[PDB]
From a paper:
The two main enzymes responsible for PI(3,4,5)P3 degradation are the tumor suppressor phosphatase and tensin homolog (PTEN), which removes the 3-phosphate (3 P) and the SH2-containing inositol 5-phosphatase (SHIP), which dephosphorylates the 5 P to generate PI(3,4)P2. The SHIP Ptase domain belongs to a family of Mg2+-dependent inositol phosphatases with specificity for 5 P dephosphorylation of inositol rings. Here, we report the crystal structure of SHIP2 containing the 5-Ptase and a C2 domain (Ptase-C2), revealing that the two domains tightly associate via an extensive interface. Importantly, even in the absence of a localization effect, the C2 domain provides activating signals to the Ptase active site, resulting in a significant increase in catalytic turnover.
In order to disrupt the hydrophobic core of the domain interface we mutated F593 and L597 to aspartates (FLDD mutant). Crystal structures of Ptase-C2 FLDD confirm that few hydrophobic interactions remain intact between the Ptase and C2 domains. The FLDD mutations also disrupt interdomain hydrogen bonds between R649 and E862. When comparing the catalytic turnover of the FLDD mutants we find that the C2 domain no longer has a significant effect with either substrate, indicating that the FLDD mutations largely mimic the absence of the C2 domain. We note that the FLDD mutations increase intrinsic Ptase activity with PI(3,4,5)P3-diC8, but importantly the presence of the C2 does not cause any further change. The PS-mediated increase in activity on vesicles is maintained for the FLDD mutant, whereas as with soluble substrates, the increase in activity due to the C2 domain is abrogated by the interface mutations. Removing the C2 domain abolishes observed SHIP2 activity, whereas the FLDD mutations partially reduce activity of the wild-type protein.
Numbering used by the authors: 419 to 586, 593 to 672, 683 to 731, 746 to 760, 763 to 775, 777 to 845, 848 to 874
The structure:
Amino acid sequence: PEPDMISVFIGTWNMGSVPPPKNVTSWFTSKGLGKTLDEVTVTIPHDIYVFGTQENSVGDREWLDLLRGGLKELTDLDYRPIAMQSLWNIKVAVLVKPEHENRISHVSTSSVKTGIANTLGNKGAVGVSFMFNGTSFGFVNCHLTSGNEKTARRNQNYLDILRLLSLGDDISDRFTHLFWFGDLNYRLDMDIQEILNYISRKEFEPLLRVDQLNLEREKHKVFLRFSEEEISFPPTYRYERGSRDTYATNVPSWCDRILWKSYPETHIICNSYGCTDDIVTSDHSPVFGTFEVGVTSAYIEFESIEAIVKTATKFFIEFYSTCLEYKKSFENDAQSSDNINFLKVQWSSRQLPTLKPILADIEYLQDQHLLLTVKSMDGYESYGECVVALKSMITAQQFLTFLSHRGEETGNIRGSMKVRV
């Protein structure tokens, strides 16, 4: 009866403060350049459409009506808005096929301004989250600091959004699938003429080697734990308005991006990632991404858990899951330190709780996830969280993962657990 997979469309477009054209068909249908949807059979009406825009001067009401009208003319379906959020001229909207409206719950929205001198809200982010049956989704649409030289400012904008957006403890591990897209504004570290030469040859690999987002991700400095699909479309900025023949330091760049972060052992596949070449009202080309995503419609026991945490003495663990009705441990009963500012802490089975899932079916349990948070006895401060999938843990089996807190890696965790049915 209920679906076990959905198709999600994500579109991002910096509209350049001018009216869009009446027809943006190519954007909605993943047609143009890059990884595209070419066949009739794969160009499907998606279950969820998410539209993120920047420099959007269309009124909220009017823009949503254009999206609803556009989807209706395209699909013959009356797509239902489930949420929308604007921050000044940064706007996101989520629309769902009518047959799925009953499956949506726990809708949330949020926005954050980023700036030192500027808090107008033309730089920042907007966010929307919800549950589709038992699977949660977060969508963040941003517009970060511009300029070739401002990489460090963009990385800080990212960190500030991650820490301050109140969707649904940062947002990193709040959702089964977190999509982050927009005008990220990362540029190419290369001279204008060399860039244009490579673009003429349709040779994108030499350019992608000097893309600042790729370099910063590779250096572990931003978008930790996010993935991006391979880019095979030309830079989406900066074009002359009225054609895509001519690019206008502001060298050509892939400013407009879609990235995702998913819970372990989930099903997610990127089916398209590209840009249009026939929408020409803005100095940016619209970018599309489509995804196939899995959705979901007994005693959990721990033999032991060991963690290494950054600290300069006693810690406990909180266990959280949507499949539970929340639970906690006693303090660690052992600790040691090979190195200064790191503490190895151990919890024997006596210190650890037994968790009780709501249903006992294997098909239900294999799709669930546990959130573990390590907190200090003194102050109840989080020193790190991680997510463990139950899919491979159903004898005792070992999990091994890493602790994160507010965008910093803060240690690791290893444990033995049993899921009995």
